[PDB]
Amino acid sequence: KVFGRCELAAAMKRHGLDNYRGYSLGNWVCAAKFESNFNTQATNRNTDGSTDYGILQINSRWWCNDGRTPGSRNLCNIPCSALLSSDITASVNCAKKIVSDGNGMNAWVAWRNRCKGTDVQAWIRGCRL
Protein backbone atom coordinates (compact mmCIF):
# COMPACT_ATOMS: atom_id res chain seq x y z
CA LYS A 1 0.00 0.00 0.00
CA VAL A 2 1.17 3.53 -0.84
CA PHE A 3 -0.13 5.83 1.90
CA GLY A 4 -1.23 9.39 1.55
CA ARG A 5 0.58 11.86 3.77
CA CYS A 6 -2.35 12.66 6.09
CA GLU A 7 -3.61 9.06 5.97
CA LEU A 8 -0.25 7.89 7.30
CA ALA A 9 -0.04 10.67 9.91
CA ALA A 10 -3.42 9.56 11.28
CA ALA A 11 -2.41 5.87 11.33
CA MET A 12 0.85 6.66 13.15
CA LYS A 13 -0.99 8.85 15.66
CA ARG A 14 -3.49 6.08 16.36
CA HIS A 15 -0.57 3.69 17.01
CA GLY A 16 1.05 5.97 19.59
CA LEU A 17 3.95 7.54 17.71
CA ASP A 18 2.95 11.20 18.21
CA ASN A 19 5.63 12.43 20.67
CA TYR A 20 6.88 8.89 21.31
CA ARG A 21 10.22 9.41 23.13
CA GLY A 22 9.88 13.12 22.42
CA TYR A 23 9.58 12.93 18.62
CA SER A 24 6.59 14.79 17.23
CA LEU A 25 4.44 13.19 14.55
CA GLY A 26 5.99 15.24 11.76
CA ASN A 27 9.35 13.56 12.39
CA TRP A 28 7.85 10.12 11.74
CA VAL A 29 5.99 11.20 8.59
CA CYS A 30 9.14 12.89 7.24
CA ALA A 31 11.22 9.76 7.90
CA ALA A 32 8.66 7.53 6.15
CA LYS A 33 8.55 9.88 3.15
CA PHE A 34 12.27 9.75 2.55
CA GLU A 35 12.85 6.15 3.64
CA SER A 36 10.16 4.53 1.50
CA ASN A 37 8.07 7.24 -0.25
CA PHE A 38 5.18 6.05 1.93
CA ASN A 39 5.20 2.56 0.30
CA THR A 40 4.81 -0.33 2.73
CA GLN A 41 6.33 -2.75 0.16
CA ALA A 42 9.68 -0.95 -0.25
CA THR A 43 12.81 -3.08 0.08
CA ASN A 44 16.44 -2.12 -0.45
CA ARG A 45 19.54 -4.27 -0.18
CA ASN A 46 22.64 -3.04 1.66
CA THR A 47 26.28 -3.67 0.81
CA ASP A 48 26.75 -5.83 3.90
CA GLY A 49 24.09 -8.22 2.60
CA SER A 50 21.36 -7.03 4.95
CA THR A 51 18.04 -5.71 3.61
CA ASP A 52 15.79 -2.83 4.71
CA TYR A 53 12.04 -3.45 4.81
CA GLY A 54 8.85 -1.47 4.68
CA ILE A 55 7.65 2.02 5.34
CA LEU A 56 10.45 2.77 7.83
CA GLN A 57 13.12 0.63 6.12
CA ILE A 58 13.92 -1.50 9.15
CA ASN A 59 17.13 -3.47 8.75
CA SER A 60 17.49 -7.27 8.85
CA ARG A 61 20.92 -7.23 10.49
CA TRP A 62 19.43 -6.33 13.89
CA TRP A 63 15.64 -6.07 13.91
CA CYS A 64 13.94 -8.81 11.86
CA ASN A 65 14.61 -12.26 10.38
CA ASP A 66 14.65 -12.65 6.57
CA GLY A 67 16.46 -15.99 6.50
CA ARG A 68 19.39 -14.67 4.49
CA THR A 69 21.34 -12.28 6.79
CA PRO A 70 23.94 -14.49 8.49
CA GLY A 71 24.65 -13.78 12.12
CA SER A 72 21.80 -11.30 12.35
CA ARG A 73 19.72 -10.59 15.42
CA ASN A 74 15.98 -10.54 15.31
CA LEU A 75 15.36 -8.05 18.11
CA CYS A 76 11.77 -7.25 17.11
CA ASN A 77 11.11 -11.01 16.96
CA ILE A 78 9.32 -10.95 13.59
CA PRO A 79 9.84 -12.08 10.02
CA CYS A 80 10.94 -9.10 7.95
CA SER A 81 8.06 -9.78 5.53
CA ALA A 82 5.60 -8.82 8.28
CA LEU A 83 6.98 -5.29 7.88
CA LEU A 84 5.65 -5.05 4.32
CA SER A 85 1.96 -5.32 5.26
CA SER A 86 -0.59 -2.62 4.53
CA ASP A 87 -1.26 -2.69 8.30
CA ILE A 88 1.64 -0.72 9.80
CA THR A 89 1.27 -2.13 13.29
CA ALA A 90 4.34 -4.40 13.16
CA SER A 91 6.48 -1.63 11.68
CA VAL A 92 5.40 0.83 14.39
CA ASN A 93 5.98 -1.59 17.25
CA CYS A 94 9.45 -2.42 15.97
CA ALA A 95 10.25 1.26 15.37
CA LYS A 96 9.41 2.00 19.01
CA LYS A 97 12.09 -0.49 20.07
CA ILE A 98 14.62 1.05 17.67
CA VAL A 99 14.09 4.64 18.78
CA SER A 100 14.42 3.58 22.42
CA ASP A 101 17.81 1.96 21.68
CA GLY A 102 20.06 4.87 22.53
CA ASN A 103 20.57 7.07 19.46
CA GLY A 104 16.91 7.97 18.95
CA MET A 105 15.80 8.73 15.41
CA ASN A 106 19.41 9.03 14.20
CA ALA A 107 19.11 5.29 13.50
CA TRP A 108 17.27 6.38 10.31
CA VAL A 109 19.86 7.88 8.00
CA ALA A 110 17.29 9.70 5.90
CA TRP A 111 15.81 11.25 9.03
CA ARG A 112 19.23 12.50 10.13
CA ASN A 113 20.11 13.88 6.68
CA ARG A 114 16.73 15.19 5.49
CA CYS A 115 14.36 15.76 8.45
CA LYS A 116 16.43 16.58 11.52
CA GLY A 117 16.54 20.31 12.18
CA THR A 118 13.93 21.13 9.52
CA ASP A 119 10.39 22.37 10.00
CA VAL A 120 8.90 18.91 10.33
CA GLN A 121 5.47 20.20 11.40
CA ALA A 122 4.99 20.93 7.70
CA TRP A 123 4.50 17.17 7.14
CA ILE A 124 1.20 17.19 9.07
CA ARG A 125 -0.06 20.63 7.96
CA GLY A 126 -3.64 20.48 6.73
CA CYS A 127 -4.40 17.00 8.08
CA ARG A 128 -7.43 16.15 10.19
CA LEU A 129 -5.86 14.52 13.24
Q: Which stretch binds Cl ion (CB under 5 A): 5-13, 33-41, 65-73, 101-109?
A: 101-109
At its nearest, how many Å lie between Na ion and the CB of residue 65?
Answer: 5
Decide: is 74 part of the binding site for Na ion (CB under 5 A): yes
Q: Which of 36, 51, 60, 91 binds Na ion (CB under 5 A)?
A: 60
Residues near 105 by beta carbon (within 8 Å), at least 6 away in sequence: 23, 27, 31, 99, 111, 112, 115, 116
Residue 46's CB: how many other CB atoms inside 10 A?
A: 12
At its nearest, how many Å lie between Cl ion and the CB of residue 17?
Answer: 14
- In single-letter form, the type of residue at position 41 comes to Q
What are the start-end ranges of the E strands in 2-127? 43-45, 51-53, 58-59
Binding-site ranges for Na ion (CB under 5 A): 60, 65, 69, 72, 74
Residue ranges of the binding site: 101
